[PDB]
Design a protein around this ligand. Structure first.
Ligand SMILES: Nc1ncnc2c1ncn2[C@@H]1O[C@H](COP(=O)(O)OP(=O)(O)O)[C@@H](O)[C@H]1O
Ligand SMILES: Nc1ncnc2c1ncn2[C@@H]1O[C@H](COP(=O)(O)OP(=O)(O)O)[C@@H](O)[C@H]1O
Ligand code: SF4
Ligand code: ALF
Ligand code: ALF
Ligand SMILES: [Mg+2]
Ligand SMILES: [Mg+2]
Lengths: 420, 243, 243, 421
């Protein structure tokens, strides 16, 4: 059962129990006791309820079959290539304050919580996913991650993809070559050669998952909102852990239910509630705080311009007949992601403005984690443009510590009061 | 008859507007227990028709219409200074810059970032320790207003310790803290636009040297309400009556 | 007599050792004026043949041989526990982890970063503000300590205000502050190598709950001097004798 | 009013510029002029500081009057050689002053590197005559804060962004070569001076000579007793980014001559037994003198700086090539030898550190990096760990441009000095 699996993975059982102990109460308060949630949330509720169970069993069984488990922290790492071989790709961006002090044993305290928390999970041996992973694929995005990989490599082999910092022709070729080098790495480690059939199948599997999430995002444009944003965030978070085929089926089953709600004009709020767009950094599970506060004040979050959100699923791979072309197309897909580690990053602004209009947003909340300098600095020019377009804008920052609620509530609620 | 209760981090304030349009006000320390402070303030108040509760303790007080201190401060300051569009409210834990329209409604606002929390409480604490057995009037033309880190109260506290540890004047450090705070709050109060004139309110406005330094840095007139502690509570009471 | 005078951020402490080898100590608050405190302390003590001065006030106090508090602390802790290689000193503004050899010599040390400044003073401030009607008996019996941000005392204060504002029990908050402070200091006390045994000293070691919570995080034996306040001053005095 | 008239023509905010400048002479007096035993040849650089915003700014302005250009840079990777080949000037404008930090924070986060915030503020407030005279800014894609700040800075002065790779493998080396060729075209376009073998070799020799003079002074600090205080050499390395390369090189070489005379008589600035310190980490732009001032006021002597205002600036020289194409490739390779923490891994920087501990007879290494500098902040872990494995005393410090944390830094430094006595 679960506890024997964690033992074989060399999980620190006591620290892990301590980490998981408060989670059911929080999930009860923020999810299960919230009314009018779609029936199709039951699958995702059960995933959270056994978050370190059945999926971790699946990954362990894949390794005993000779497959591998690749851990990633950025949407730029090509899931299509890993899944082509029948290995697993999981995303282990950290979202927990519990592990931050452990991360600070080797990292500066003035650093993104996402990075510190992930490092602490691996160091304390608290996470069964991090324990079952064979490899970490890092990328050269923000400063903290780039330099963290050097340290993390002492605990788990880290392969570091060099992502460039512009999107010119030279950059796109450089990234193409990085993608082909990574393809070779995967082949070597798995012993599974990429060919037209298995790469096509891997592309198809991940396009299906993205398409599912795109379908769910689109349904949020309706009025009244058919689903609270917090439920969608959760679903986008679990995209990084779940089986992609099952996950896509369950997302699509939810969309069918939401379509019926839309057809009957049913929603989770009244048509007068303020519709909010979140933009900024990803919110990894269980960093639910900002959604929870907005929707507990009577707002509804109707989209996330973030990598646990729109930036993850909006762009699909285009098909091609051979491996060479599919690999070029996989590189191109990821370079559509308008992350603030690129300069300039004007496409992200275009995305935000388009989402405001497609989602009929009453206000934009720009949320970035403390000490995330790419999104922290870029927030100035984003705010300046939304201001001159008369789009209400609130800039928020926090870390994973859950108890700064009062400060965040006053700022959020004053904003909602203002835009009513 | 119409009550506004402002349950702040540091002080809790109650304004009562009577049928004849006049009002009374009471302030008591919060003592980290806003429920107790609100019950105490409402003790013997009379029959209340409408109540609005604001501040941090609004999340816990079990009656009254809830409204944020941003909206209340705008409304209250509008009652006093309809002709001034910008408000700086310095409290014990938060700083707020607010721009209001000709009806006193919020057009835009900004609160301190996380690293700028606690400015007012730090001023309260350090002034009690190194005293100010001088009178405010003397910090204004100090020759040595030693510059002190504006980053946060942790960095500033460190410098205060080292500066007094090596024999720097008490007054010079006090002057330095007020000038650094004023320079930071001057930039802050321009965040929504350059005010032609600024209302400075909240308890932090009750430091006359801070107001003078702020006004010199900003280069425009800074008006302080006759009782800056209660302006947000007045706004709550006005909203309660309007409601 | 050989005297050691530790003019710290928060308290100033005096140790006098006779020829016998017995010693007396005296402690007074620094009140941001180290010279005054050192003057007050040394009065009517009898004439001193050697003096070592340490702490923030050491330079300004223009007497004696000046030695840093890192070296003094290692000395005075070596007298008491020569078999323990590691020392955690928590004062009012600084935190320090010290590795010394079998002869008492410092072989490595580490002091807190800028954002970790002022941990001790914050605990004193907070305990005062929230008082503690509660007995220290309790914080160990606390089944629902609330984890508080470990970044710095600014972020921790913000959370303390939020928790009490919404009705969290002071006991849950106080227990959470010590626990979180213990957790960070435990990791901090391993920066120099993981000790098999730890000396915990400074005024910070006088909080009973911090001692227990620290030991439980460390997972190893913790020993606390009879008078943690004065061990750095004893080191200074032992150095005055040796010099 | 020759200088104030020029500043007025540069649209300097004259009021704030005086208030910026008013406190500096007393500091310089205290940390430099009143310090005993300084070489006579410090007189030149002392004069530069005395008129820091005059002679040189006038030269730059006169250069613009003749159709040449002024390029402002913030990182040693930008090839001074290409700019100088055309006759145009290259100056480095990394910020080192708390004064402009609040101004920078009007458009930047407050928890960002002070180097960046101070530079941003100088331009926003129109404080700095050098920034006011510069035609262009050349920004590089190094740390997060700088890369994203350039996008904001472009609203005030045109910014050309060079993309530096993040590794040093063959594909990175070729990439950087192409960026250098792109940059060369940009300079040709803005100056109207097409590069050729003649003027590009000339440009290379001029900067190679400046680098060589700085290398020469660096090697002389290896002698015991130290012939010069590290604070004076920091100053010189700081002024290398403002001064005329030729005049600067000549005056550094004149200083080295006097220092050789000191070495030849066993003359030093401190005793034989004073702790010898290596600084490593981030650059310390003028006037960020605090750390050196504190080490040496505590009886130590800084004998080297493993930073870009220091060793990383001058260690590597361009190698000769016959034609323009080969010189551009060699310029590119020179700068790619700099072991900045923005590259991964950055194992050369650790080899340089060990090499300088041995050559400069170092008793302790002080790793100093600016608050919120994340590349060097993070890399500090592995660096201190390897110096620990090698029994090299190691002290990690951090600070910002605020001067009044002296008490905290003194206790840390002095306890370290006591530890390595
Ligand atoms: N004489 C004084 N005593 C106490 N606080 C004062 C005094 N004068 C000014 N203040 C300032 O008033 C602040 C509290 O202001 P207030 O607006 O009541 O705070 P809040 O609304 O945040 O509870 C204190 O932090 C202090 O900085
Ligand atoms: N009863 C108490 N009163 C005051 N402070 C206490 C008490 N018990 C423990 N302390 C702690 O001791 C600290 C003072 O420690 P000390 O070593 O004297 O400081 P320093 O050497 O830095 O002046 C305070 O900041 C506080 O956290
Ligand atoms: S100590 Fe100051 S700078 Fe550091 S995180 Fe806290 S408030 Fe921010
Ligand atoms: F309640 Al406050 F600033 F802390 F108004
Ligand atoms: F003087 Al201290 F910790 F602040 F010993
Ligand atoms: Mg208030
Ligand atoms: Mg002490």
């Amino acid at each position: 059962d679960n506890r024997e699996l964690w033992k074989v993975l060399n999980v620190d059982l006591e620290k892990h129990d301590e980490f998981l102990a408060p989670v059911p109460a929080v999930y009860r308060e923020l999810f299960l006791n919230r009314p009018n949630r779609p029936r199709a949330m039951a699958y995702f509720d059960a995933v959270v309820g056994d978050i370190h169970g059945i999926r971790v069993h699946e990954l362990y069984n894949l390794k005993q079959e000779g497959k591998k488990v690749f851990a990633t922290f950025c949407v730029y790492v090509p899931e299509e290539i890993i899944n082509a071989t029948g290995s697993a790709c999981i995303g282990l961006c950290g979202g927990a304050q519990y592990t931050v002090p452990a991360g600070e044993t080797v990292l500066p305290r003035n650093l993104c919580p996402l990075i510190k928390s992930a490092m602490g999970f691996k160091i304390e041996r608290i996470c069964p996913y991090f324990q079952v992973a064979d490899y970490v694929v890092g990328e050269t995005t923000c400063d903290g991650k780039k330099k963290a990989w050097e340290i993390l490599n002492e605990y788990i082999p880290v392969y570091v993809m060099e992502l460039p910092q512009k999107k010119e022709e030279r950059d796109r070729k450089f990234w193409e070559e990085e993608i082909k080098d990574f393809a070779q790495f995967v082949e070597e480690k798995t012993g599974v050669k990429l060919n037209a059939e298995n790469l096509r199948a891997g592309i198809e599997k991940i396009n299906k998952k993205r398409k599912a999430l795109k379908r769910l995002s689109d349904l949020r444009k309706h009025n009244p909102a058919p689903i609270h944003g917090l439920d969608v965030l959760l679903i986008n978070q679990l995209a990084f852990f779940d089986d992609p085929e099952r996950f896509a089926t369950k997302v699509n089953e939810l969309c069918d239910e939401l379509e019926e709600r839309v057809a009957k004009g049913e929603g989770v709020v009244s048509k007068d509630a303020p519709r909010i767009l979140i933009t900024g950094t990803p919110q990894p599970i269980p960093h639910w705080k900002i959604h929870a506060l907005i929707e507990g004040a009577g707002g509804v979050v109707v989209g996330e311009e973030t990598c646990i959100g729109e930036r993850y699923f909006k762009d699909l791979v285009e098909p091609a007949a051979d491996v060479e072309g599919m690999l070029k197309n996989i590189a191109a897909r990821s370079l559509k992601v308008n992350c603030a580690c690129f300069t300039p990053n004007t496409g992200r602004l275009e995305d935000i403005l388009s989402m405001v209009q497609k989602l009929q947003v009453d206000g934009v909340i720009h949320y970035s984690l403390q000490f995330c300098q790419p999104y922290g600095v870029e927030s100035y020019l984003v705010g300046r443009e939304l201001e001159r377009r008369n789009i209400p804008f609130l800039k928020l920052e926090s870390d994973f510590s859950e108890e700064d609620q009062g400060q965040l509530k006053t700022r959020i609620e004053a904003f909602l009061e203002m835009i009513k | 008859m119409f009550a506004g209760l402002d349950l702040g981090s540091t002080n809790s304030k109650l304004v009562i507007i009577k049928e004849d349009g006049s009002y009374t006000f009471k302030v008591v320390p919060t003592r980290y227990e806003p429920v107790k402070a609100g019950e105490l303030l409402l003790k013997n108040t009379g029959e209340i028709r409408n109540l609005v509760v604001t501040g941090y303790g609004r999340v816990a007080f079990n009656r009254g219409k809830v409204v944020t201190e941003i909206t209340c401060q705008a409304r209250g300051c509008h009652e006093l200074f309809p002709e001034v569009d910008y408000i700086l409210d310095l409290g014990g834990q938060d700083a707020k810059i607010i721009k209001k329209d000709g009806q006193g409604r919020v057009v835009n606002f900004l609160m301190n970032d996380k690293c700028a929390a606690g400015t007012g409480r730090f001023l309260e604490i350090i002034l009690t320790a190194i005293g100010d057995d001088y009178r405010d009037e003397d910090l204004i033309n100090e020759e040595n207003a030693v510059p002190i880190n504006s980053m946060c109260t942790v960095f500033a506290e460190s410098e205060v310790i080292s500066l007094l540890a090596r024999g720097t004047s008490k007054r010079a450090v006090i002057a330095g803290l007020f000038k650094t705070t004023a320079k930071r709050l001057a930039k802050f109060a321009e965040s929504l636009g350059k005010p032609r004139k600024l209302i400075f309110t909240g308890g932090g406005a009750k430091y006359p040297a801070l107001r003078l330094f702020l006004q010199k840095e900003m280069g425009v007139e800074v008006v302080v309400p006759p009782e800056p502690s209660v302006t947000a509570a007045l706004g709550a009471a006005l909203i309660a009556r309007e409601t």
